[PDB]
Amino acid sequence: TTQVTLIHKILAAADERNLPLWIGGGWAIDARLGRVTRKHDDIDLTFPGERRGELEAIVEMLGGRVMEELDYGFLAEIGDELLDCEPAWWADEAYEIAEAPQGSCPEAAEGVIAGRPVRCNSWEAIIWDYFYYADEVPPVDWPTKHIESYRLACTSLGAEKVEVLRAAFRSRYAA
Numbered sequence: 001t002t003q004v005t006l007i008h009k010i011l012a013a014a015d016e017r018n019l020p021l022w023i024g025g026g027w028a029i030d031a032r033l034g035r036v037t038r039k040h041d042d043i044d045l046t047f048p049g050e051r052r053g054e055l056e057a058i059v060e061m062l063g064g065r066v067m068e069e070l071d072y073g074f075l076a077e078i079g080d081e082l083l084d085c086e087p088a089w090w091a092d093e094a095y096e097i098a099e100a101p102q103g104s105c106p107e108a109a110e111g112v113i114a115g116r117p118v119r120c121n122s123w124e125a126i127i128w129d130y131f132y133y134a135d136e137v138p139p140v141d142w143p144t145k146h147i148e149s150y151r152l153a154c155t156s157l158g159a160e161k162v163e164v165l166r167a168a169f170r171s172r173y174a175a
């Protein structure tokens with residue numbers, strides 16, 4: 001239960017600060033489904049970019065530290081667990097992940113992890129990131145756990161919507 005216990009600790013500390021945080025990536029899939037479906041390599045979080053200091057304070061207060069600074073965000077470690085953190089920026093009516101489809105950070109808690117309601121990135125935002133991944137690593141070459149998580153997200157959003165979103169991504173990044 002270590003990752004779930006950590007997620008609950010991180011979100012309790014964020015709630016106390018009125019700091020919204022969105023579960024992303026694998027755990028966001030499981031949160032929207034309301035079921036734990038696999039072992040997760042890390043915990044992905046999306047945070048208000050202008051409030052980054054408050055997230056780092058939560059990390060430090062849990063005994064962790066910022067471990068690596070990335071082009072898109074940062075990685076922090078709390079004990080043996082990894083947090084993969086990406087900023088979202090206020091766009092008049094909601095926070096949005098840069099370059100992602102609108103609605104990437106919904107206001108309402110739309111997922112559940114071990115009985116706790118949680119904010120989590122939208123299905124479109126989740127799936128969008130696999131498109132980047134497919135440009136970096138041929139899907140035929142993906143580790144099976146990513147093929148399976150992608151297919152689960154696609155089943156949940158629906159093939160029609162996914163085909164449309166993929167086409168939008170291709171048009172966005174077409175030469």
Ligand SMILES: NC[C@H]1O[C@H](O[C@H]2[C@H](O)[C@@H](O[C@H]3O[C@H](CO)[C@@H](O)[C@H](N)[C@H]3O)[C@H](N)C[C@@H]2N)[C@H](O)[C@@H](O)[C@@H]1O
Nearest residue numbers: 024025042044072084085086097098099100129132133
């Ligand atoms: N919004 C724009 C950004 O969107 C994607 O970035 C995503 C990262 O790729 C994810 O991180 C993954 O990749 C890391 C580096 O390989 C791994 O350490 C990590 N465990 C993986 O989950 C992270 N969780 C979400 C983030 N949206 C693109 O790729 C990036 O170019 C683009 O600027």
Ligand SMILES: [Mg+2]
Nearest residue numbers: 025026042044
């Ligand atoms: Mg992850």
Ligand SMILES: [Mg+2]
Nearest residue numbers: 025042044084
């Ligand atoms: Mg990750």
